[PDB]
Amino acid sequence: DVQMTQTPLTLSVTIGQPASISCKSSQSLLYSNGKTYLNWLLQRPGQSPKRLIYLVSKLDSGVPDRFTGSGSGTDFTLKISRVEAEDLGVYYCVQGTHSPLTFGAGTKLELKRADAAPTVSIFPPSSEQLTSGGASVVCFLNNFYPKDINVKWKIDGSERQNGVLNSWTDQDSKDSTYSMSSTLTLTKDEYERHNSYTCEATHTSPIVKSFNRNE
Amino acid sequence: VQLQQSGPELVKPGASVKISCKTSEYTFTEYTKHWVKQSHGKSLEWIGSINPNNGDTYYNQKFTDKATLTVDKSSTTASMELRSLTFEDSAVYYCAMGDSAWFAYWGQGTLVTVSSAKTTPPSVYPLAPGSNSMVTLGCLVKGYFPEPVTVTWNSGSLSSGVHTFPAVLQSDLYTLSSSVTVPSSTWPSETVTCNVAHPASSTKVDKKIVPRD
């Protein structure tokens, strides 16, 4: 099986600066008809692959021109001269000269921008869920940068660690920011046993939001 | 053009499943159709490829174990039957074009969950503020199985300020949440709703985000 070594595995690029991804193969990709069957694909998370370069250098019908592809035999390179927010996602090489078709591991391209604070929001448990005997305090940390950020939970002044669930999004395709959700889930009884609930973001830091159960 | 993949499947371990792919326009039905497996969070693997003209199948030996590729008589539908399914077969399976259109067009689906659990439809809870420029609402969708769940706001009219966070498995059940941000004048005057659909349990909820007190 042709091994396809893609490099680097991650990339972080200030918008307007260029990017470069290399693909090296254990075998030659030249086919006996003189054509080399090497594609460059882009994938934004959740979505499906889109083709960018075929036959090593040809742009597909819709693709911007800051994309170029070069190489021959066993070394290929994809180049972006000016990267933009749209270009985010995972770039793969794939060869189809040899069988089985084999893909590179991928290259996550990450856009760099100016720092941004989260707009944080806290939400007390709904009355609908309280009727069922549970309580989930939801916190949203939306549209921030850089990607590293933490939530801390303070019940009645002190840190609570049991009951948390955390989910991160990928980078945004327009403003190139990040977002996060954090859920503290108590039982109805434990929840009605305390009054003050705080959600604290360590990242312009910290940023806090609270609510009082008695209000 | 399009490739139209069949929908999300829940399949017990040991069973089989068949995933189909319909060509939208006659012109691409002759083309070779490829099948690729993307495991969650991961990279891409080639399963194989079928020639809708004559029926010739070319497999990546790793999957002769597991994949059969056929085509209907029209050659408008190329299928893949996954036999004797293990937990490692849970993934997204894509269907992609070949020949001179090699990997230019990809289908969208298909998520396959191999598991023995029953489906559990989510609970849905509305997240209203309750104590400046804009207001952020939310929809908590807790404890469902399997994946996926689709969430929309006002049936797709609201897409700009939406964040739907990836689900997280918590002791046999998935939880996700979604935020939306609208102008303060919009709400609560006009209506904001999360629509949440869980097909494996044929469940759909339309939860209005009414303010609290």
């Binding site: 008809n33 069957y37 189809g96 069988s99 078709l101 | 070319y58 020949d99």
Partner: peptide, 6 residues
């Protein structure tokens, strides 16, 4: 031409 697997 083309590889037949392609």
């Amino acid at each position: 031409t083309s590889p037949r697997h392609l």
